Amino acid sequence: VVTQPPSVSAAPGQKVTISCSGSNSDIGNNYVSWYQQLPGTAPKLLIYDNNKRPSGIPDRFSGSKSGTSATLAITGLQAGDEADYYCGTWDISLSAGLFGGGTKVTVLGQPKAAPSVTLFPPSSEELQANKATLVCLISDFYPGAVTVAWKADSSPVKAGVETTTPSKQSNNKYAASSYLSLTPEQWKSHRSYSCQVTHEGSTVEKTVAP
């Protein structure tokens, strides 16, 4: 089994290294390739034939291979390098491809950013279909951890709430979403709804009145 550390961390601009450890049957007698898997995307080839970069791959990525070990080095670490990295190899005696377990790269000390909150009330189409869903969108925040609480007028509401785990936007900040499903007696009675977002101990709350 080809092994890698489960995680590695550094601050922006710093050098990070990831080693792949195998046997004489795989890495020892073959070549190692490295794959980048950004969140919610397909893997991408970073390095092949131990140390070759495909065209378009940043030169901050480099590879080396010694005996049964291989190393991927990432210089000038950027937030956009946060991903899972896998080494890949071929073991000719088994005629099979092998992957390391993957190493999660975290870029520590990125700048903090409070969330913005956008709240959509139910659409006339959904209301006509006898259903009612409020959609709260949380965006542009860092670190990627929030708690979302809802109120109908001043009453806390737990039932009918669903929230996504934050994931990155194209600008490297995080976004999340939360949903409040309502009963016809909630929609006929409440005058307002509120989506309360807690991030790093401070709260951002948006209210909508149908």
């Binding site: 956008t118 959904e126 969108l137």
Partner: protein, 216 residues
């Protein structure tokens, strides 16, 4: 230089899936094609490979009596068939084209991957609703994609003409066992009076596409 794969579908335990992988350039040339899977939130796992130009193939020992790999030259499509599906076979099935012209080969061109869900629960297409822009929401607008099964749903805007400012959220799995997601886009406020906004929702597991107009 692109490998095309679908969404794609729902399987009961014990059934089989055929995952398709089509080369864009109309050839595999003398390159290899490999199948790699990934269970949600887990690592990559090699399943099998073929060099279509030669017909030479190999499959992972762990899948030898369950996996068949083949290549269709006429439509430059490779196929992998996994039989006796188990709960643990729920995964994204990627196809990747090799780097070596037929041995320092690597997986150089990757497909988007097809999610195969193994479950006894029935398929359900989504209900799509607009998230209309207003003074209360540059302006944010979107689409709510409600109560579908299994995953995934993909969302594009204006048939791919709108990519800037688009954020499609992961789905939420509700108590009912159905998923929901939203796709939102931030646009210049002035564009609200000069162009139309249509979200194109694809739910390949139910073979459904919905084009939903989003009006202010």
């Amino acid at each position: 230089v692109q490998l095309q794969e679908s969404g794609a579908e729902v399987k009961k335990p014990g059934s089989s899936v055929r995952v398709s992988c089509k080369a864009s350039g109309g050839t595999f040339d003398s390159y290899s094609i490999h199948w790699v899977r990934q269970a949600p939130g887990q690592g990559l796992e090699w399943m099998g490979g073929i060099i279509p130009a030669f017909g030479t193939l190999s499959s992972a020992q762990d899948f030898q009596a369950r996996v068949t790999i083949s290549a269709d030259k006429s439509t430059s499509t490779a196929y992998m068939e996994l039989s006796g599906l188990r709960s643990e076979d729920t995964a994204v099935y990627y196809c990747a084209r090799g780097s070596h012209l037929y041995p320092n080969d690597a997986l150089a061109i990757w497909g988007q991957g097809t999610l195969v869900t193994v479950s006894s629960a029935s398929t359900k297409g989504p209900s799509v609703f607009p998230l209309a822009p207003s003074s209360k929401s540059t302006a944010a607008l979107g689409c709510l994609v409600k109560d579908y099964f299994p995953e995934p749903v993909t969302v594009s805007w204006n048939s791919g003409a709108l990519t800037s400012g688009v954020h499609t959220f992961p789905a939420v799995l509700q108590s009912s066992g159905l998923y929901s997601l939203s796709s939102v886009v931030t646009v210049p406020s002035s564009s609200l009076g000069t162009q139309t906004y249509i979200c194109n929702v694809n739910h390949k597991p139910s073979n459904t596409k919905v084009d939903k107009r989003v009006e202010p």
